[PDB]
Design a protein around this ligand. Structure first.
Ligand SMILES: CCCCCCCC/C=C/CCCCCCCC(=O)O[C@H](COC(=O)CCCCCCCCCCCCCCC)COP(=O)(O)OC[C@H](N)C(=O)O
Ligand SMILES: *[C@@H]1O[C@H](CO)[C@@H](O[C@@H]2O[C@H](CO)[C@@H](O[C@@H]3O[C@H](CO)[C@@H](O)[C@H](O)[C@@H]3O)[C@H](O)[C@H]2NC(C)=O)[C@H](O)[C@H]1NC(C)=O
Ligand SMILES: *[C@@H]1O[C@H](CO)[C@@H](O)[C@H](O)[C@H]1NC(C)=O
Ligand SMILES: *[C@@H]1O[C@H](CO)[C@@H](O)[C@H](O)[C@H]1NC(C)=O
Ligand SMILES: [Mg+2]
Lengths: 328, 1035
């Protein structure tokens, strides 16, 4: 037929190789080193999570005999609630104030897509021509909606404020920073205002506000660096969540100048401007205060999971060791 | 009844006559593209991907882009389409060459040249020496007396020896000249076209008389006219009616057992896919009723009832869960198939050096079926044997020669050099002339025979109807006694270079019952000798008392029979002058027809051959191919049963069976007569021959055994099954005198009644039908026609290479394919089923758990190379250990690596991996991931966490599956993970992977998916080690 095939390791199926075999001297240890590493890791995560001071307040007001049930039927649009909570142990270090929503499917396929990333990036062409992707909120009546989509339209718009009830019974408002609550990439890369101009009013010309927003995107914040698409609260909302039960960062409580605790233990009252209606779909609003920990947040699941998986490896390691000895 | 009118092109033009052109190709230039009907319908996967492409086209119901389904689909369809095109284009070339073959035809008044296409029924043709017969013609005349003709039926049966044919007596003496052939008008009412080659029924109506016709007067299309200057015949069957073409099956699309299994596996996946999507579609309809309709934030306009909302995502979830049957699986199979096939071509241990011909995987699809073989059906001549028949040993007088005691053959000019004789004592005795027995022994070989001379271009080439005589006469030439030529009345022989013309006065004939031959030759001096030669049994029955060499030659024959050498006893007598003259008158009187001429000839023949004196005995060797007996035993240890289907005689087939060690002294031979009694006994009632272990049947007995109304069909179905049941429970089955179609029907019988994977191996056109019929067809190279090679899936030169094809390439290819399939499903069920679990946490909205750019690149970049290399470079044991332990082959025979049980276990593995891959990240995120201004718990982080844990897990799984860890294998497994984590680190998504919790979740998810597997794999081998594991463990 043809000439002799050339002699190479690949072509003759004789490439240099290594033949691993699952021997007892190789699998028994890894079932013990893994178990010996997953137990201390589980203890380390589990103990640190329990060492986090966290208070969660549910101000949805669904249940009766609660001082927020009046806002479920807001005869007057501006509604206010006062929830009193107590911290047995003072918080330390930076404290993050989140708001929680339950049964709020922000991961719905019909909802996750309802946005125009090109417009949010600061595209002049897409500013007046939002994509069909945000179809239900493309144009209000004649001119396009600037934050188009169901994600921007349904933006959380409750105002939460914290007061400390001191020994004198006079509330002490606590400074709450609304900056630095979004990703650095989000503020400086993903989200930008439309190009040109110096005043946000002129940039957003010929673009109506979203249907559900009370005021346009011009004055989301007084600071020019926190208004428009680069608004911190708006950015935090648009960054969708993975599961129906989620919490989003709302405010920052920086370390106090004095050595005293950032939130000294005592009496506190939450003054909330009830605006977001959630009880229609059995949703539940919440407010969460948490204290920073060097080892992430408060995750009891992982610590318990490492203990379970770490312990089971010992069981398998011993069982495999026993089974081997019988069949050695 | 077939009717043929000579020199009448328009006798029956008033379609049923087939023009002499042949048509073996399948696709024209127009009906080629419609092969998609064959590709789409036979494999349901192609239809499913077509449904996906159509389904993803409509924007109303879509979740993934369609450009990622069209391009791979064209690759899957394109590669198979091109493979069939090149195969079919080749078949066009073969038909063109055969059709354009030149011949001579009686057109109006004269012999004018024409091609094989232009030949038609009732067409008188002239064929010269060494010309192929263009159609089934009735021999009319020839260039030699009595219109005697010789043909080489190498395509009807694989034998090369000349076949003897005659013509009608009346036509012989009238149609010699061209002029009479032109005006010849003979009407023939012969049988209808058929595949039977040894029988012909017909009569020639000519000159107001009827002359019956037999197979001895019909030259078939596969014949070659030899040793005759020219011959004339009128075409009877042409083109497709010729018995050779009726002995030819259709070229089918051969596909592997695993290919059929995957179809059944994929059917189940469709059922789950529809049921999963339908179940999730129902849940969305319920969810939209309670939660979706009351959710103001989800309002989108276009008011659709929840029933319609549920309906739409059913197609959305079909697209989301589309990779449950991935197109990348079939794109990757072709790469695996092509690579596995090139290792057969590149094999240096399947490369024949002296002929300079490597193996060739002519079909790249059936690599893993080589590991499934149950039966091998092989030809004898040229496949098991070299087709060379040499003279090995001889018991001249009393002494035995050819014992390597103490050749150039330069002392005689006629010595061609074919013989490889090593004994020098015999050469010395011949030249010395001390013993006259030596001279007479080889003189008898050069006299008593029917061998014929060619004398072409000064070469003294011999042609014979019996290969035994051709070998003996060739040997006699090498020892000086060369058969120069023979006329009607005399024979010329060179005795040690001295011309000597003997005037033969009577030539005794050979018959199956006679089992001998003799010849009366008068020496020039005046003496008369009866040189006789025949089988040992008949010869010794006609000896006389004074013979003192009875015992010495009897021992020599046993020695020759020990090494499986065909033997013949040589004898001579010293007839007087008057004794022959009186008998010659009697013999001549017996030559007339009288009444029968059979009894008279037998009677006078017996009296002729009385009182014979012995000269010795011969021992002819029918050479086996190198490594044939070692291969047959080796393949038997792999529980592969080898059947020998040959077109040769029963005597030669049985002799090679003993040489191959297929039959031994322990085997009890069952013949056709024995079988018919048993099959009838079962009919009028596991077989008793289960302990007999041998079975030799002729093609004629096959027709009777196979018996080839509603009740008759049942008997046909029953009788065939009974024979197959009996034959399959025999160590060796040798079918002899079988036509090319009978070779295929035996392969088909085992395929139907045993569900066995069959391999057909052979050379020449005789074996093309069974090569096309068997699951795997192998063509032995060496034939200039290259007809068995061209129709074969694989083709090497030596039978012994069947060891490496089956025990190395077929064995590994089965392991590598099954490993590839089991992992490829796992990695995609573990990948696509995460969307199923996420459906419960997003309103069954068909939202995917991964980023869009990860869904496209998963099977392309992150899990593509490692499985391709494992499917191309994985070896449980080396080639040396594969051949040392043929028992490892039984793993693929019983289908122990791919099954319903093995397939569903990979679904359970995938279903559990996707379950773990989703619910550990879910738990770690339902409460709090590391949360601050710069934090995950986003949807992007959730998709990044599962994708990172999925890529590591599946890439670590293939590491466990891989057993041959080459550097390329190691680089791809860690390179696939390094590529995933390189693409999403600038060469959002990167942000999640910088958090300790996001990496702690991935580590936990990977270990929970891999550690239980490591335990099971280690636990599986400790209590239930496999044959490969034990060899590797003790390696
Ligand atoms: C840093 C070191 C890194 C080293 C390794 C890195 C990896 C590099 C890999 C290179 C080889 C790539 C192999 C690609 C396999 C094809 C899979 C495929 O087909 O994945 C289709 C998409 O693939 C395509 O878009 C076209 C592929 C063309 C293949 C080219 C010919 C084959 C190349 C062989 C290369 C051989 C290399 C040499 C071998 C010795 C999606 O399957 P699927 O998702 O199931 O379904 C989607 C779903 N139905 C739909 O509708 O969306
Ligand atoms: C805070 O956000 C909520 C949305 O969760 C806002 O409620 C929404 O207000 C818009 C009006 O701006 C409502 O749209 C339409 O309002 C007209 C009256 O102008 C009414 O006739 C229509 O029937 C329709 O309601 C929208 O329905 C309403 N959302 C819900 C769930 O009822 C709220 O105004 C925001 N408040 C602030 C202070 O930002
Ligand atoms: C909460 O505090 C407010 C103001 O201090 C008070 O009017 C109200 O009665 C308190 N409610 C409860 C339940 O303590
Ligand atoms: C709560 O906040 C509102 C608006 O900022 C203010 O009018 C009110 O006096 C505050 N205190 C309450 C409601 O006790
Ligand atoms: Mg042959």
């Amino acid at each position: 037929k043809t000439r002799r095939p050339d002699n190479t390791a690949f072509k003759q199926q004789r490439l240099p190789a290594w033949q691993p075999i699952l021997t007892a001297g190789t699998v028994l240890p890894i079932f013990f080193i893994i178990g010996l590493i997953f137990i201390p890791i589980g203890i380390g995560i589990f103990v640190t999570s329990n060492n986090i001071r966290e208070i969660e307040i549910d101000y949805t007001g669904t249940e009766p005999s609660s001082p927020c049930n009046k806002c479920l039927s807001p005869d007057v649009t501006p509604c206010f609630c006062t929830i009193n909570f107590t911290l047995e142990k003072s918080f330390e270090g930076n404290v993050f104030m989140y708001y929680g929503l339950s049964n709020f499917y922000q991961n719905h396929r019909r909802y996750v897509k309802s946005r125009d990333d090109s417009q949010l990036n600061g595209d002049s062409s897409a500013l007046l021509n939002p994509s069909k992707e945000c179809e239900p909120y493309r144009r209000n009546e004649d001119k396009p909606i600037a934050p188009c989509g169901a994600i921007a339209n349904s933006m959380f718009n409750d105002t939460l404020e914290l007061f400390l009830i001191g020994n004198d019974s006079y509330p002490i408002p606590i400074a709450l920073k609304k900056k630095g609550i979004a990703w650095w990439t989000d503020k400086n890369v993903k989200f930008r205002n439309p190009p040109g101009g110096d005043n946000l009013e002129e940039r957003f010309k010929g673009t109506t506000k979203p249907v559900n927003w009370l005021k346009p995107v011009y004055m989301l914040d007084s600071d020019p660096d926190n208004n428009g698409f680069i608004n911190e609260d708006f950015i935090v909302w648009m960054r969708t969540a993975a599961l129906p039960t989620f919490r989003k960062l709302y405010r920052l409580i920086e370390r106090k100048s004095d050595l005293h605790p950032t939130l000294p233990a005592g009496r506190y009252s939450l003054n909330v401007t009830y605006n977001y209606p959630v009880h229609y779909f059995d949703g539940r609003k919440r407010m969460i205060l948490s204290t920073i920990s060097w080892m992430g947040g408060k995750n009891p699941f992982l610590g318990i999971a490492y203990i379970a998986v770490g312990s089971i490896s010992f069981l398998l390691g011993v069982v495999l060791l026993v089974i081997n000895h019988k069949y050695r | 009844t077939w009717q043929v009118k000579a020199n009448d092109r328009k006798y029956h033009e008033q379609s049923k006559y087939a023009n002499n052109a042949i048509k073996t190709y399948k696709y024209n230039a127009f009906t080629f593209i419609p092969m998609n009907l064959f590709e789409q319908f036979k494999r349901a996967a192609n239809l499913y991907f077509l449904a996906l492409l159509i389904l993803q086209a409509v924007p109303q119901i879509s979740t993934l882009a369609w450009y990622t389904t069209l391009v791979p689909l064209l690759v899957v369809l394109g590669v198979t389409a091109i493979k069939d095109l090149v195969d079919d284009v080749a078949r066009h070339k073969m038909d063109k060459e055969i059709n354009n073959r030149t011949c001579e035809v009686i057109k109006d008044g004269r012999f004018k040249v024409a091609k094989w296409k232009e030949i038609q029924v009732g067409d008188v043709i002239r064929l010269k020496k060494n010309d192929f017969v263009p159609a089934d013609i009735l021999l009319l005349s020839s260039s030699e007396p009595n219109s005697l003709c010789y043909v080489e039926t190498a395509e009807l049966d694989g034998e090369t020896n000349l076949k003897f044919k005659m013509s009608l007596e009346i036509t012989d003496q009238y149609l010699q000249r061209e002029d009479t052939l032109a005006t010849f008008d003979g009407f023939i009412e012969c049988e209808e076209p058929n595949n039977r080659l040894d029988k012909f029924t017909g009569t020639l109506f000519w000159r107001n008389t009827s002359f019956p016709l037999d197979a001895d007067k019909i030259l078939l299309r596969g014949c070659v006219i030899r040793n005759t200057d020219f011959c004339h015949g009128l075409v009877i069957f042409a083109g497709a009616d010729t018995k050779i073409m009726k002995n030819s099956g259709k070229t089918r699309f051969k596909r592997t057992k695993i290919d059929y299994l995957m179809n059944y596996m994929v059917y189940t996946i469709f059922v789950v896919l529809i049921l999963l999507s339908a179940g999730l579609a129902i849940g969305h309809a319920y969810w939209e009723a309670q939660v979706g309709n009351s959710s103001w934030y989800l309002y989108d306009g276009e008011d659709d009832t929840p029933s319609y909302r549920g309906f739409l995502i059913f197609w959305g979830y079909i697209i989301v869960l589309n990779t449950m049957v991935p197109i990348s699986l079939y794109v990757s199979v072709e790469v695996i198939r092509l690579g596995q096939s090139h290792f057969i071509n590149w094999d240096l241990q399947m490369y024949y050096a002296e002929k300079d011909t490597p193996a060739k995987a002519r079909t790249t699809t059936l690599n893993e079926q080589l590991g499934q073989i149950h039966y091998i059906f092989s030809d004898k001549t040229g496949t098991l044997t070299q087709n060379i028949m040499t003279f090995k040993k001889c018991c001249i007088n009393g002494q035995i020669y050819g014992d390597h005691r103490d050749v150039d053959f330069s002392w005689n000019t006629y010595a061609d050099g074919k013989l490889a004789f090593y004994d020098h004592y015999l050469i010395e005795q011949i030249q010395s002339g001390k013993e006259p027995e030596v001279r007479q022994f080889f003189f008898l070989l050069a006299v008593c025979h029917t061998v014929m001379v060619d004398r072409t271009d000064g070469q003294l080439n011999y042609q014979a109807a019996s290969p035994d005589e051709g070998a003996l006469v060739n040997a006699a030439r090498n020892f000086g006694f060369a058969f120069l030529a023979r006329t009607q009345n005399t024979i010329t022989i060179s005795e040690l270079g001295t011309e000597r013309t003997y005037n033969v006065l009577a030539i005794l004939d050979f018959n199956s019952d006679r089992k001998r031959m003799s010849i009366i030759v008068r020496t020039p001096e005046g003496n008369i000798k009866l040189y006789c030669k025949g089988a040992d049994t008949v010869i010794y029955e006609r000896l006389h008392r004074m013979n003192p060499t009875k015992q010495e030659t009897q021992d020599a024959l046993d020695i020759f029979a020990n090494e499986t050498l065909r033997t013949l006893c040589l004898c001579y007598k010293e007839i007087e002058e008057k004794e022959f003259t009186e008998w010659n008158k009697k013999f001549m009187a017996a030559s007339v027809a009288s009444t029968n001429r059979d009894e008279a000839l037998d009677k006078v023949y017996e009296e002729i051959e009385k009182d014979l004196i012995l000269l010795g005995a011969t021992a002819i060797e029918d050479k086996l191919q190198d490594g044939v007996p070692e291969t047959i035993s080796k393949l038997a240890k792999a529980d592969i049963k080898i059947w020998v289907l040959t077109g040769d005689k029963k005597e030669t087939a049985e002799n090679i069976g003993f040489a191959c060690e297929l039959l031994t002294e322990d085997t009890t031979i069952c013949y056709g007569e024995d079988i018919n009694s048993l099959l009838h006994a079962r009919m009028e009632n596991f077989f008793p021959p289960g302990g007999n272990r041998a079975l030799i049947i002729t093609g004629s007995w096959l027709n009777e055994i196979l018996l080839e109304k509603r009740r008759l069909e049942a008997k046909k179905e029953q009788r065939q099954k009974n024979f197959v049941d009996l034959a399959c429970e025999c160590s060796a089955v040798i079918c002899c005198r079988v036509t090319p179609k009978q070779k295929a029907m035996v392969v088909d019988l085992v395929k139907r009644y045993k569900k066995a994977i069959t391999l057909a191996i052979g050379d020449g056109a005789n074996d093309v039908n069974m090569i096309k019929t068997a699951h795997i067809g192998v063509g032995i190279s060496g034939q200039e026609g290259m007809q068995a090679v061209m129709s074969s899936d694989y083709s090497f030169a030596q039978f012994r290479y069947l060891q490496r094809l089956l025990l190395v390439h077929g064995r590994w290819s089965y392991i590598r394919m099954c490993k590839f399939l089991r992992y490829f499903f796992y990695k995609n069920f573990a990948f696509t089923l995460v969307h199923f679990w996420y459906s419960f946490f997003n309103g069954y909205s068909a939202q995917t758990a991964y980023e869009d750019w990860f869904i496209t690149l998963y099977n392309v970049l992150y899990t593509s190379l490692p499985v391709l290399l494992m499917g191309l470079l994985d070896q449980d044991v080396s080639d040396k250990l594969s051949l040392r332990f043929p028992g490892l082959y039984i793993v693929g025979q019983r289908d122990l690596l791919f099954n319903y049980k093995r397939f569903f276990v990979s679904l359970l593995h995938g279903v559990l991996t996707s379950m773990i891959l989703f619910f550990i990240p879910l738990g770690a995120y339902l409460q709090t991931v590391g949360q601050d201004g710069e934090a995950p718990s986003d949807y992007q982080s959730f998709a990044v966490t599962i994708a990172s844990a999925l890529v590591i897990t599946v890439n670590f799984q293939i590491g466990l599956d891989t057993s041959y860890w080459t550097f390329v294998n190691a680089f791809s497994i860690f390179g696939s993970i390094a590529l995933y984590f390189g693409i999403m680190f600038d060469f959002t998504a990167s942000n999640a992977l910088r958090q300790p919790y996001i990496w702690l979740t991935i580590i936990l998810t990977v270990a929970v998916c891999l550690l239980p597997v490591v335990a099971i794999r280690f636990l599986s081998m400790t209590i239930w080690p496999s044959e490969s594991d034990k060899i590797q463990k003790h390696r």
